[model samples]
Target: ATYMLPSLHDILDQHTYKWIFFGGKGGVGKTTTSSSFSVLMAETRPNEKFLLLSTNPAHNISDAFDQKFGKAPTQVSGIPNLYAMEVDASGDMFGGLNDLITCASSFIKDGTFPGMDEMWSFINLIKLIDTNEYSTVIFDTAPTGHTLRFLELPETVNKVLEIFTRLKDNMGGMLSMVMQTMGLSQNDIFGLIDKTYPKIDVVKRISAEFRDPSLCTFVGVCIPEFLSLYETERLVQRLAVLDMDCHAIVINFVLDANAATPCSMCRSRARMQNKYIDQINELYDDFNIVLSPLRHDEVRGIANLRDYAETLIKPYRFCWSA
Candidate 1:
């Protein structure tokens, strides 16, 4: 019987989306799942350009493919249409934000806020989103706490652009005096801002479109443990707060051991894992949940990643939800 079994096939077979993000708490195989998802996207949908872009400074995508990728896109060996790029937060994009903040505080707030510095790289990432260079772009996002800053991102850019529009007067050279010891005109700030802020609009618009489930979707990864399930719920909850859709959960790292030689301690741990797996199955009843087991060998490199990809698609039969 099909038994209402679930796999990740719907994400692939049913809808063709432009942005796909794989996210979860740190150390829960987010990179593994995202990398494998991109691999599956490339191999399964040949002729579409698949880009597995990573925003985690860990650059785990490179390690997943066993290749090095700079900020610029790099080719992966096995998959012809697949390419990936590892992006860290900074080293360009949005020009200089220093004066904007100090001066903008005059408008209301300053760039000295948290996530301000990283917004440089973040702005560029949205620019990459703006370009049609890749057919489908998949994001291997930072862990929950970090990535959520980008969720609150619009609050910041939204304020900045408002100041730009609100600068009826007393900005321009007046604003220049506030920031600097250097100098700027309204035109200078306007040109600098107007030049790069298309992507600000991109961030605004893209983040807005995140509300549309079919266009951009989030896949959450978790281990079968208390905190993982706890955070997976948080991931889904927070995405909902931002009006983003999260309809899938990858319950990875479910422990397995032989029936015999199950030590009291090991047996207890496995039991706890099983408890959470059933709980997750029951909790997210409507979700496309794929119960991923802990592999004996480390899941590294494309060969193993290919196996993981298969694991995601082939439904692992489960009757535990009840």
Candidate 2:
């Protein structure tokens, strides 16, 4: 029963997009959708390599695949060409604030460093991008606010580094004066600045290439709820500001009218889902919006994820309104 609708394969066939991002509000199944898409791609193109990377600190990619994965690329059990990793937020560079404070204490033994918990996602994302080891990289991002911040990181990093470099260079003769004014030592500050410039340059180059449609595509994921749709809209707008391409959106947990049950709660929920679906269709008319129905079981293992992927590729099988 083909739904006369396009599948994930159809979408991928149309573009040469390498970096695919699945992002939306929290609890909207971004991890599930992104993981399923990765599985489908791996199955479809067994000759190529695919990496399912999660930027969410509260990661569930390992749980979704029923396989344990660490911070690095680990082969998904029984799936060739497919690897998974949860970019560790507590990695060396993005360790706890206490750790940063301790390190800073060694130098000055005194001032405040802007708490950097928010910066870990950005650092982890860039490291993955720089690796460039896979043919396809599927990013299961954090909730809207965090994910939006992640997208803004390259620009932010570049700007900060650029400003610091100018201050370091133009402050010459009075460079010591400037360092003293800022309550910093040149040896320590300048040493770190020199080491960071190369990494910043690499991320800048990566970000520039990412703005191209051929290289990256941001996929906005949402449900038929108000909050999810609202966040999805904002995510796309932010993507546009970055000049990043976001041509597709996945509307998950849609109600299937044909699969309706006699349960009062189920019917009531369906009506509400329909109301939002209408709103979503109206708002996202320009985007390639795909519908994924609510499933009976939690999408956990590879077998279940394949079923989920089928729903994403094909149109709603039963009558699904709004």
Top TM-score hit: 1
Q: Considering only N, C-alpha and C atoms within 3 Å, which residue pairs clash in candidate 2?
A: 7-313, 8-313
lDDT of 1 by residue, 30-135 (tens): 8999998888888888877777888887778877778877887788897878888887664343336555655565534464455555556566676665564676
**How do the predictions measure up, each by TM-score?**
0.83, 0.79
Candidate 2 similarity to native, TM-score:
0.79
Segments of candidate 1 deviating more than 4 angstroms: 1-5, 91-98, 107-119, 126-132, 169-190, 193-197, 255-270, 317-322
TM-score of 1: 0.83
Highest lDDT against the true fold, candidate: 1
- How many clashes does the backbone of model 1 have? 0
Instruction: Give the C-alpha lDDT of model 2.
Output: 0.72
RMSD vs true structure, all candidates? 3.7, 5.4
Candidate 2 lDDT over 233-297, as tens digits, reads: 89888888899988778888877653466777767878888788779767666667788888999
